[PDB]
């Protein structure tokens, strides 16, 4: 088969996922995040160890304090732009959407729930019924629930950002997956997959709009396999190739942009297998999305 596929069977035959991913940790870039370990920063970061280099974080557009931990991720060979971000805080809420409306983001990606674990992971940043939208006062921003669509482990929701100050209004998507536990992997590469193109299919992702926003809790475990994977289909697709992709190297090109990407050698592992099996959609097996669908039992 490809030769992903011919690496994927030697490293399983050797059992070598935690020396592959260990060597990917020694070799990944190290970028000084002066602005994140600031003083003044310290109640906008929800884990110590887990910060936006400077030269490639966001910076909210606003003469106070222009800090927010999320990173721009820009894929130049793909010509795929996404950005990653932790789970807003109770404080940070106003910065997020603040962001979204700022880089003019279309979609939401969320890969983590308010509650994991017995803690609370992040935020609860978006409405939860219609006849309750948020105000967030800080950044001058209203969000409404327009709808949703729940499946048995995603959600769909629309949601309405206007900017207070000039009345402009925007449709926002909101991708939820919410059976993918942190430092774990999704039930299988149909349910993720069934996931991923759905993500696509709406739109979000076209150069036409900003990066999407991908978070999870840190913003880089769960997040970082997403788009790993969307990245490794998208330079396959770009090319009708999948033999030209180099799914290590990527994810340290990934790395340059966010510290921390992937999180486990089995996330590692997962990302090879969800690329291998969308390829089979890339390489014209139209039928194959039906199939995800089915398996991932999203109507129950
Ligand atoms: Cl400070
Ligand atoms: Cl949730
Ligand atoms: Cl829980
Ligand atoms: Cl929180
Ligand atoms: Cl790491
Ligand atoms: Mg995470």
């Given at each position: 088969?490809?030769?992903?596929?011919?690496?994927?069977?030697?490293?399983?035959?050797?059992?070598?996922?935690?020396?592959?991913?260990?060597?990917?940790?020694?070799?990944?870039?190290?970028?000084?995040?002066?602005?994140?370990?600031?003083?003044?920063?310290?109640?906008?970061?929800?884990?110590?160890?887990?910060?936006?280099?400077?030269?490639?974080?966001?910076?909210?557009?606003?003469?106070?304090?222009?800090?927010?931990?999320?990173?721009?991720?820009?894929?130049?060979?793909?010509?795929?732009?996404?950005?990653?971000?932790?789970?807003?805080?109770?404080?940070?809420?106003?910065?997020?959407?603040?962001?979204?409306?700022?880089?003019?983001?279309?979609?939401?990606?969320?890969?983590?729930?308010?509650?994991?674990?017995?803690?609370?992971?992040?935020?609860?940043?978006?409405?939860?019924?219609?006849?309750?939208?948020?105000?967030?006062?800080?950044?001058?921003?209203?969000?409404?629930?327009?709808?949703?669509?729940?499946?048995?482990?995603?959600?769909?929701?629309?949601?309405?950002?206007?900017?207070?100050?000039?009345?402009?209004?925007?449709?926002?998507?909101?991708?939820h997956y919410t059976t993918w536990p942190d430092?774990?992997?999704?039930?299988?590469?149909?349910?993720?997959?069934?996931?991923?193109?759905?993500?696509?299919?709406?739109?979000?992702?076209?150069?036409?709009?900003?990066?999407?926003?991908?978070?999870?809790?840190?913003?880089?475990?769960?997040?970082?396999?997403?788009?790993?994977?969307?990245?490794?289909?998208?330079?396959?697709?770009?090319?009708?190739?999948?033999?030209?992709?180099?799914?290590?190297?990527?994810?340290?090109?990934?790395?340059?942009?966010?510290?921390?990407?992937?999180?486990?050698a089995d996330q590692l592992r997962f990302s090879?297998?969800?690329?291998?099996?969308?390829?089979?959609?890339?390489?014209?097996?139209?039928?194959?999305?039906?199939?995800?669908?089915?398996?991932?039992?999203?109507?129950?």
């Amino acid at each position: 088969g490809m030769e992903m596929e011919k690496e994927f069977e030697q490293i399983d035959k050797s059992g070598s996922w935690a020396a592959i991913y260990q060597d990917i940790r020694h070799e990944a870039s190290d970028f000084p995040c002066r602005v994140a370990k600031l003083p003044k920063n310290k109640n906008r970061n929800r884990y110590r160890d887990v910060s936006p280099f400077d030269h490639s974080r966001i910076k909210l557009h606003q003469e106070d304090n222009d800090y927010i931990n999320a990173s721009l991720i820009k894929m130049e060979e793909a010509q795929r732009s996404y950005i990653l971000t932790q789970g807003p805080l109770p404080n940070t809420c106003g910065h997020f959407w603040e962001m979204v409306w700022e880089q003019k983001s279309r979609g939401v990606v969320m890969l983590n729930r308010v509650m994991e674990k017995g803690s609370l992971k992040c935020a609860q940043y978006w409405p939860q019924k219609e006849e309750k939208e948020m105000i967030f006062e800080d950044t001058n921003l209203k969000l409404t629930l327009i709808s949703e669509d729940i499946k048995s482990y995603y959600t769909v929701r629309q949601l309405e950002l206007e900017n207070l100050t000039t009345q402009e209004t925007r449709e926002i998507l909101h991708f939820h997956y919410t059976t993918w536990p942190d430092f774990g992997v999704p039930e299988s590469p149909a349910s993720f997959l069934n996931f991923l193109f759905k993500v696509r299919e709406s739109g979000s992702l076209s150069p036409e709009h900003g990066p999407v926003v991908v978070h999870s809790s840190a913003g880089i475990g769960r997040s970082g396999t997403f788009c790993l994977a969307d990245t490794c289909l998208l330079l396959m697709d770009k090319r009708k190739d999948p033999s030209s992709v180099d799914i290590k190297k990527v994810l340290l090109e990934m790395r340059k942009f966010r510290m921390g990407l992937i999180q486990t050698a089995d996330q590692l592992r997962f990302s090879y297998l969800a690329v291998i099996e969308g390829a089979k959609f890339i390489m014209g097996d139209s039928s194959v999305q039906d199939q995800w669908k089915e398996l991932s039992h999203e109507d129950l």
